[PDB]
Structure formats: C-alpha cells, structure tokens
Amino acid sequence: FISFEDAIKRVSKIFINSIINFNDLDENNFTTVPLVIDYVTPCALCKKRSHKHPHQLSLENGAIRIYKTGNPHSCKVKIVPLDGNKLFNIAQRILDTNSVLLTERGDHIVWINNSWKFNSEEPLITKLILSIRHQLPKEYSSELLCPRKRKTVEANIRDMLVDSVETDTYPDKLPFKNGVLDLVDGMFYSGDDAKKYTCTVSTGFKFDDTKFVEDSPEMEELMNIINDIQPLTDENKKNRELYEKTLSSCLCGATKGCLTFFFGETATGKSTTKRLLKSAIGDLFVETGQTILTDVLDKGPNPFIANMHLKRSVFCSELPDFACSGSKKIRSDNIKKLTEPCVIGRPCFSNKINNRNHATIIIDTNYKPVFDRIDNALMRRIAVVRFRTHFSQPSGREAAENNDAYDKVKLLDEGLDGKIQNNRYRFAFLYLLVKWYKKYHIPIMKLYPTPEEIPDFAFYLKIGTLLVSSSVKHIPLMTDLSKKGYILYDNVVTLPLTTFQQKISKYFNSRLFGHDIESFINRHKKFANVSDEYLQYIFIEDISSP
Amino acid sequence: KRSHKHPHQLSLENGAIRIYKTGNPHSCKVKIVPLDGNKLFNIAQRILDTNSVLLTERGDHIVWINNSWKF
C-alpha cells in the first residue's frame, strides 16, 4: 500500500476539474463521503456536460474504482492500481509470449518477421519490443514509444532470463525465411507454427507455394537436363540411385558418416549439379578449400571449420593431381575425424573448440584419389559416383566419340547458365529432392560405402579373400601342410618369406603391388627366432586341403 | 463474414478511435486505433518514409547525401 497523499494526487489528476470537497477527505472516510466536482469543463471519464450527480470511490483488490451514482451508463468506470512498476508489468507481458530466449552459447535469440533472429553485437531486444508494441493494450504503446523506457524494459527482460534452451533439435525440418517445411508429408508451416521448432538458420530466401508445383515446363526442362547428365539406363541404375541418395541426403540435419567422390573426366556437368544445388538450398551450401584434406586441424586457428558449423552441405572442388610432383596425399586421419558428430577446431581469436557436424561433404575431382595410408577404417568411410556423359561442341564430335572414357556425347548447349544463376529452376529442384527424400531416407537415413571402386583399395580387399589366419583348427591336417612344406616350430604354421614372395608372385604382378606387399610384410612381421622369418597366415587357394 | 449488411460506425474516446458494427455488435469485431504520440517518433517515421537510409547485410547503414549513396 502507498501513502494516502499519493492516491489523492492520482485521483485528483485523473479528474481534470478540481474538487471542492478536497479538505473533508480523510484516511477513515474516503469511501463514504461523496465528492463534488466543479463542472466548468467536461469530466475526463465521459464528456457529456455538467453531471448532475456526484461520484464515489471504492477499494477492492488493491485498486480504487470510481463510479457515478445514478444511472451506471452515464459515466464510465475508472480503475486506479495501487503499486507495481508499469515498465515491469510490460516486461513481464512481453516475456510471457516466448518471443525471446537464451541459448546455451550465451546469446539471446528473438522472434520477428516469422524468423528467429540472432545477433551478438546488436540490440535486437529493442527492435522486438517496438515490433510487439501492437499486440499490447493501447495504454502501453505510448510508454513503448520512448527509447529510454525501451532500454529499461530490455534491462528487466535481461534480468528475468536465467535458463538456457537447446536449438536445432529437429533433423527433418527445412527452415525458410517465412516458414518451415516438414520433409515427412511435404506440407509447409507458416507464421507462429514455425516458431515451435527453434531453427536459428534459414535458406536465405522466401518460400512460395505457387512455384512448388509438380507439373510445369520448367520441371520438364529440369527432367531433360537430369536425364542428359545421368541417363536412366540399366547399366547406371546403381550409379543413378547413389546419385539420387547423395543429393537427397543434403536436406537432413542429422550427422552423416560417409564422403562422396564426384569422379568424371571433364565437361561432364558436375558444376551444373553444384550450381543447381546451390540455387536450391541457398546459403546452407558452403564451398571450402582442399586444406582440410591435406593439413592438420588442432594447431593454430581454423576458420574453415568454424564456418562449417551447422551447415548442411560442404563442397570441396578442384582437387589437384596427386600423381605429379609436390603432391600432398590425403590425410586418412582427417577423413576419420570429419565423420564425427563433433569436430575439434578453433576460430580466429576465440576459445570454442567444438562444432556440430550436419554437413554432407562432396568432393569434386578430375583424377584418381590417392591417400597416404589405407586401412579397414577408411574403406567404410568412402563412396564414389561416376560421371560418364560428354557435352561437347559438334566441332569436336568425333574428337570425343573415339575416346574410351566418355560413354555418350551430346551437344554442348550454351543455354542454362544465367537461367540457373537466375533461379529459373530453384523451386523445381526442391520438389524432386523432396520426392527422393521420401523415396529413400524417411524410415532411417544412413549412407553406405562403396569399397569396390578406388582400385588402390582393391589389393587390400583381395588379401582378406586370398589369405586366411592360421589357427589350432589347422592342426588335424598336419600331413597336408607337410605337403606344402610348412613347419610347426613355435606351435604355429610357419611361412618362409622366400616361400611367401614366390607364392604371391605367380598370382600378383607385384610392382604396383610391391609397395603394399612390403607394407603387409612389415606390419605383420613376426620373427620367431633370429633367422626364421615366418608368417602367421595361410594361403587358402593352394592349401585348400592339399 | 459476408458483406457486413449493417454499416460500420466510428467513435472517439480518451484520444482513441474505435470502429464497431452497428445493429448487433456481436456479429463483428471492434477495432482500436491510437492517436499521435511523441513528436520525435513522428519525425523519425516521416524521415524513414522517404527511404533515405537503408540497412545492408553486413550490419552497416547507407545514407542518401549529396545525390550519392554514402556508406
């Protein structure tokens, strides 16, 4: 409760005309004695003219109600609150609508223009207050107009926030500038309904339902282009399926555990696909350099990894040839590190060393890829898609048909280009991508390796098929190995190195196999004694019960 | 609704404009319009109406001074 003098001052300021009964008001009979208002001007409550009846004041719920005796409809009812800072009430009302939140990273995110705006050096709170002014009752807009009061309300809001909320927890939602698309049923939310999912990123362009139509001439042109780049023949059925799967996987916000190689000779349309994808998803597509595959990440800053955070598609193009001089073989450790939910890297002048990994990594290349060390761990984290269709000027028609690399040559059309840069097929591609996502990834999203390609791996694939590990179960046929000439010295089927190379020479041509053969020799080298250079392996082809 | 058979009506009270449907008020919704507030806010709105200042993507503001966009 406040002092009676303050309440009298408020009630006297509410009534524009003076009160001739001012003196008789006391702290004990302020709700009993009628007050007389000199009616030289119309009263504040209702204009009328010269009310013929006095008024009266009542106290209820810590509030003062003013009512005129007689007909109730003659004068309006006025309520005077007791205490409570009006700015604090406005701040509580604004905080109520869940329009501003605090994240784990220590920053505030606001909700304006159907978008979760987020900044660290701007006063978005004041902009949110000014925008939300309309939804409040009209007695608060006048207060909200002044900037100092907005600063006070912002201070109250900042003081009233104590907890943090997680962000980007839905992996199957596509955020736009004016809504969120659901990848399950394909129906697009808008307005408040999109605010339910806290997505701090967006495609950067508005979503329009008019162009999101299955049937359109642009769709036919896009289908023709896709068929030209990837023919729908029986041979490339698996290749086209892998192409579709990889393209569709770029929409999911989960973590992917494979890398895709876009392998093709030249002028095969890889850049066309990259530009179409860039026009499709907008700024969720990020192009980076080759340093990540050639350098290490822990030491010093790494702005590339910092920018990789929360991006849904990463493209590394123009891979240099590793056969030439000055080659830097692809670091297998980088490949193993880039397929983890968290990637350790530091920005410039910062301390954060953890980033979320939601990006599908696609590498465009013109030559074969070469790594430094090959193991079974790498074979489960690689995939390749072969591009075999040339698009050439008829001036070099025969110049390409004789080539054994290209499988089908078409006319290089100088069309597309700017149209693709004009987003002429932006919304058309989204329909196809959503259709492929529904076709493939809805039950469980997961990529699969293709170890059969990359012939450098092939030798390591053969050895496991060709060689087997000796064990105790090969004892019962000691005669058969006695036929081969092996010995049970140290209770193990030995294998002389001379015998091993003479055995493998007749089945493998060595040379290009020689380096990895020696690597196998030293990696699995066992010296039972000083001069018995035996091996713990059995050749299944010739010791298949000989 | 359809065509608002009963004409609307405008009223003034406490410096506030009110719009309500005549006849049966329960068949429509009442609308509220405010009055002019701070002079400085009106001046700011008037200045912004001319599109003389724009905001870029880099967080900077550009202005239209001396017949040339200065940033």
Next chain:
Amino acid sequence: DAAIRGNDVIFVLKTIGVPSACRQNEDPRFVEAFKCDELERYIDNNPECTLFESLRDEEAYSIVRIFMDVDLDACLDEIDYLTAIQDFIIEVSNCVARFAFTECGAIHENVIKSMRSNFSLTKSTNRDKTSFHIIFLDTYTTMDTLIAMKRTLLELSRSSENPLTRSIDTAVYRRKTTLRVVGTRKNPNCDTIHVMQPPHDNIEDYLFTYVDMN
C-alpha cells in the same frame, strides 16, 4: 495414460455445506450422480433446485478442464464489454501458455491455440452486476496444477488494469472445490441465475468435469 478413461458421469451436490459423513455414505439427498441427459431432465423437471458441480475422488481420476470465475459489480456498454473480454482472454491465454511452457514443460503454441480455439461463456440476470464462468473445452490438466497456477493468476490480477482481470477470483482453486451449475438457483429464495449464450446450446460444453479428448 488415461486413454480409454474419459469422464462422463456427473457428480453433483444438491445442497451447500454438505455434512462430511453424509458425503462419505453417499446420501441420496445431498449427493447424486447423473448423466448429461439425466441432469438436463432433472433440471427441466425442477426449476427451483439448487445444484453444485464438484468431483468425488481426486486420488483416482484427476483430469478436468480449465475453469475461471469473474465477478464485477458494475454494468457497461456492449462495445466496451467486447473489447475488455477479448483483451482479458488474450492475457489469460498468454499467461497459461507461458506457465505451461515454463513449468509443465508443454508447448506454448499448442497450448495457446487450443485455449483460443473454443471457450464457453455465461451471463448473469443481474442488471447492475457482471459475473460469468469461463470453461475451456480443449485444455486439460489436474487440480494441483491449477493450485500451483493460482499464484501466477493472483499476480496477473493484481498487476493488470482491465476491470475484469482485476476481478478474477483465485480462491476457487482449492481442494474439494465446487462450481454452481449454469441455470440453477444459487439460493432457495434468490431469482438470480445464469443464462445461456448463442455460440453453444449444450450443457456438455459448460461443465468442467466433462472429460472427452478429441
């Protein structure tokens, strides 16, 4: 959870201040249980009755709708009434949605849209008074949740300025609470009752104990 469990029996008290032992023994005069059609027929046969709506066992079934009471001792015109009621409903829906997000852990948007979708309102025959009960059909919660929320409602009523928002009675959120049946006499010698509204014409929509999820 409840799933199949949907409340449809109407437990009613026929007299204020029922003795506790008579309630325990399920007396046929002060305690009764009807159906919706049965209650409607009983009300139709006896217009002079006095009935109050309340729960019977709060330890077994504890699902109800959201109910609020407003009573202000002053009349007002139509346009101001509509403006005030829309402001009040917006404020209370926002407050309940914020509480549900903060404490109950539910979704703010779903709660607010369900609250603003459908709501039932009444009116009083009094000329110089405005009192009504608001029941939300699409929102469900337990009694203790409302008891906890009563603090937030009390501060909302104290802080606000709209005349009916100051007139929200938080005392109804109590254990073994009762609510008067619409259209039934409060006192045996009082003609002030509650009248119906055009939006809804069913008693089922004006009982907080009726549980039927859709």
